[PDB]
Design a protein around this ligand. Structure first.
Ligand SMILES: *[C@@H]1O[C@H](CO[C@@H]2O[C@@H](C)[C@@H](O)[C@@H](O)[C@@H]2O)[C@@H](O[C@@H]2O[C@H](CO)[C@@H](O)[C@H](O)[C@H]2NC(C)=O)[C@H](O)[C@H]1NC(C)=O
Ligand SMILES: *[C@@H]1O[C@H](CO[C@@H]2O[C@@H](C)[C@@H](O)[C@@H](O)[C@@H]2O)[C@@H](O[C@@H]2O[C@H](CO)[C@@H](O)[C@H](O)[C@H]2NC(C)=O)[C@H](O)[C@H]1NC(C)=O
Ligand SMILES: *[C@@H]1O[C@H](CO[C@@H]2O[C@@H](C)[C@@H](O)[C@@H](O)[C@@H]2O)[C@@H](O[C@@H]2O[C@H](CO)[C@@H](O)[C@H](O)[C@H]2NC(C)=O)[C@H](O)[C@H]1NC(C)=O
Ligand SMILES: C#CCN1CCN(CCCOc2cccc3ccc(/C=[N+](\[O-])C(C)(C)C)nc23)CC1
Ligand SMILES: *[C@@H]1O[C@H](CO[C@@H]2O[C@@H](C)[C@@H](O)[C@@H](O)[C@@H]2O)[C@@H](O)[C@H](O)[C@H]1NC(C)=O
Ligand SMILES: CC(=O)N[C@H]1[C@H]([C@H](O)[C@H](O)CO)O[C@@](O)(C(=O)O)C[C@@H]1O
Ligand SMILES: *[C@@H]1O[C@H](CO)[C@@H](O)[C@H](O)[C@H]1NC(C)=O
Ligand SMILES: *[C@@H]1O[C@H](CO)[C@@H](O)[C@H](O)[C@H]1NC(C)=O
Ligand SMILES: [Cl-]
Ligand SMILES: [Cl-]
Ligand SMILES: [Cl-]
Ligand SMILES: [Cl-]
Length: 527
């Protein structure tokens, strides 16, 4: 029996066998008052102590959310769907500690992605027991509110101020500061890491002054706040709140009376109406997301980034070779996970309408002009690949590179990676390549389990990534120093060196996607 005294009461964990060793897991520790009733849409409230022993021996409820229904029975999509009951009562976190109890272990805190509308910390690919077993770090992950319940915004109104899911994250970072020393962790050595919207969340904690003292360093996998989907204007946020108010029958002159009416609606009526709150949506629509609330985020974050107003520390940032392909089978004409998806020029132009609905004719022609200058115009997958690269460069790769450039300009060490290995177990077809989200299982060390169907070269790759991430968190420097590995150079705004991650040979390269990102980052914001 393993019982740990926290600030709010005792918690009981469970022992797990991992690679002929042992890890102690505490699953489903509450870190806030359940945000129900009059607490729905408000910032998370502190917890009243308990006197029994809280049993933290199973994952908790995931937060309310809509579920992807495009491919029922298909593991490629269903592996991202929540795997515990959905409930508003979802403000819980998990802790994996090495056995025997460490003395002053570095702490890694995971923030999951999902477009700020979906996600849960209990997914199989987020299991922290391997990192705890192999590197002797402590791993923490939390559930935070998503969709309208996490991000509905009436700017300035405490009954629905916005950014509630971000304050959920922040209250969990505070829980670690106040309690992790009792688990053997070092609260002065905490690294946040996250992917997609989780990575955008990490980047906003670098900018929020209320998070400054709650972590040391940051890792951003395939996301950053300057991505076009990641921050919502106060303009759209207000239009979106009122549109939801109309859809549920809650239109009222007194703004606060709207929130009260929305608080007597069942979670399912809210969830079903989130989608139509926007006139035209895309596969990357973030109906309810982060806003400039004047609290978590004190100014538009492009301005904070440009003018150097962020926590000065080291960052690790990276992207995957085929970020864009996953979204093509969720609406682009002629695309299918079940054939090779060779599209024509006409289908390509229609795909741009789907992904850029509010963009002028000239705006769409300029995308086409820049991405259809083939070497061999006979290659039948020309248009299929162009649309993938368009979606990935615009939405993930060029924002992450620009974030890294601007951040490094204020004097801190940054390290950039390009992940280009396609999992041998990947259920999606080969044309989709090295997809968004499929580096995560290598970061968490699932290929170190010989019992799965991963190759020997993938065990080797994951082992190296796990050491680099852990060395970054402990020491600020993501080297693998023992096995004659390639040295990872610092990313500077001048030379812009990055490291490639693959099973063949890691290489140092310069100026990733230079020509493409000049288009997206300089020209296209004007249109
Ligand atoms: C656990 O270790 C900390 C030191 O953490 C390191 O220093 C940080 C600056 C950061 O770089 C981390 O990544 C490092 O791992 C010890 O902190 C000391 O605490 C005493 C008393 O509180 C204080 O007088 C010292 O100045 C602190 N030292 C530093 C460098 O800040 C802490 O005591 C250790 N705790 C245990 C139980 O071993
Ligand atoms: C701001 O919202 C209005 C209203 O949205 C409509 O009603 C909501 C309940 C929801 O069902 C939306 O999907 C609806 O569109 C938007 O006004 C509509 O705009 C579309 C096209 O832009 C038009 O076809 C509708 O007739 C408009 N309806 C009304 C009542 O004016 C408006 O576009 C939104 N603002 C922005 C900038 O998009
Ligand atoms: C690749 O598949 C898409 C999608 O086709 C669907 O999946 C299969 C079960 C197929 O057998 C059809 O029953 C399904 O519709 C194909 O796109 C469709 O093409 C037809 C033209 O014949 C068109 O009428 C549909 O609207 C298209 N559907 C969508 C969603 O765009 C596509 O033609 C296939 N490509 C190749 C190269 O085979
Ligand atoms: C996969 C995939 C494709 N699908 C797209 C649509 N999604 C519908 C619900 C909302 O998801 C999202 C909406 C908007 C922007 C988004 C950006 C990134 C992501 C990333 N992820 O979801 C994971 C964590 C990698 C699985 N999701 C976003 C379901 C996933
Ligand atoms: C909390 O757990 C206490 C200990 O029981 C443990 O859990 C059971 C399921 C066995 O698997 C074994 O590992 C332990 O004996 C219980 O005595 C206590 O009642 C539990 N509390 C609540 C509220 O259920
Ligand atoms: C929404 C939800 O998950 N509710 C509760 C579930 C179900 O009520 C039952 O398992 C029957 O479905 O049961 C628990 O009490 C349990 O048995 O550990 C945990 C949880 O609080
Ligand atoms: C709205 O109603 C609340 C509660 O009755 C009240 O405190 C607030 O002042 C009202 N505001 C307006 C503008 O009527
Ligand atoms: C270094 O190589 C040895 C070879 O036996 C291997 O066992 C070990 O896991 C490697 N370490 C890393 C960090 O890759
Ligand atoms: Cl209540
Ligand atoms: Cl161009
Ligand atoms: Cl052509
Ligand atoms: Cl150009």
């Amino acid at each position: 029996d393993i019982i740990i005294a926290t600030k709010n009461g005792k918690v009981r964990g469970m022992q797990l066998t991992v690679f002929g060793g042992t890890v102690t897991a505490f699953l489903g520790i509450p870190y806030a008052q359940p945000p129900l009733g009059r607490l729905r849409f408000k910032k998370p409230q502190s917890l009243t102590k308990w006197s029994d022993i809280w049993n933290a021996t199973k994952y908790a409820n995931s937060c309310c959310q809509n579920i992807d229904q495009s491919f029922p029975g298909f593991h490629g999509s269903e592996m991202w769907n929540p795997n515990t009951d959905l409930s508003e009562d979802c403000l819980y976190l998990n802790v994996w500690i090495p056995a025997p109890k460490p003395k002053n272990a570095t702490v890694l805190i995971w923030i999951y992605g999902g477009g700020f509308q979906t996600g849960t910390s209990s997914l199989h690919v987020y299991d922290g027991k391997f990192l705890a077993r192999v590197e002797r770090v402590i791993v923490v992950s939390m559930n935070y509110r998503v969709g309208a319940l996490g991000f509905l915004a009436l700017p300035g109104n405490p009954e629905a101020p916005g950014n509630m899911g971000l304050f959920d994250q922040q209250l969990a970072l505070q829980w670690v500061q106040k309690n992790i020393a009792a688990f053997g962790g070092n609260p002065k050595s905490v690294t946040l890491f996250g992917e997609s919207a989780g990575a955008a969340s990490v980047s906003l904690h670098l900018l929020s002054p209320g998070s400054h003292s709650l972590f040391t360093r940051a890792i951003l996998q395939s996301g950053s706040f300057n991505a076009p989907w990641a921050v919502t204007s106060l303009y759209e946020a207000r239009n979106r709140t009122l549109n939801l108010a109309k859809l549920t029958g809650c239109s009222r002159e007194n703004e606060t009376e709207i929130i009260k009416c929305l608080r007597n609606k069942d979670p399912q009526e809210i969830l079903l109406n989130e989608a139509f709150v926007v006139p035209y949506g895309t596969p990357l629509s973030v109906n309810f997301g982060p806003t400039v609330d004047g609290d978590f985020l004190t100014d538009m974050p492009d301005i904070l980034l440009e003018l150097g107003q962020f926590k000065k520390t080291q960052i690790l940032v990276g992207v995957n070779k085929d970020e864009g392909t996953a979204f093509l089978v969720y609406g682009a004409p002629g695309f299918s996970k079940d054939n090779n998806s060779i599209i024509t020029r006409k289908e390509f132009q229609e795909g741009l309408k789907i992904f850029f609905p509010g963009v002028s004719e000239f705006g769409k022609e300029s995308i086409l002009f820049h991405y259809t200058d083939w070497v061999d115009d006979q290659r039948p997958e020309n248009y299929r690949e162009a649309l993938g690269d368009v979606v990935g460069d615009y939405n993930f790769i060029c924002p992450a590179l620009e974030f890294t450039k601007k951040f490094s300009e204020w004097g801190n060490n940054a390290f950039f990676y390009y992940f280009e290995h396609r999992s041998s177990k990947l259920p999606w077809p080969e044309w989709m390549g090295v997809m968004h989200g499929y580096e995560i299982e290598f970061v968490f060390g699932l290929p170190l389990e010989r019992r799965d169907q991963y190759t020997k070269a993938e065990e080797i790759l994951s082992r190296s990534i796990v050491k680099r991430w852990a060395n970054f968190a402990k020491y600020g420097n993501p080297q693998e120093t023992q096995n004659q590995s390639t040295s990872w150079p610092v990313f500077k705004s001048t030379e812009q060196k990055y490291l490639t991650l693959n099973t063949e040979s890691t290489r140092i390269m310069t100026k990733l996607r230079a020509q493409q990102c000049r288009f997206w980052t300089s020209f296209f914001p004007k249109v």
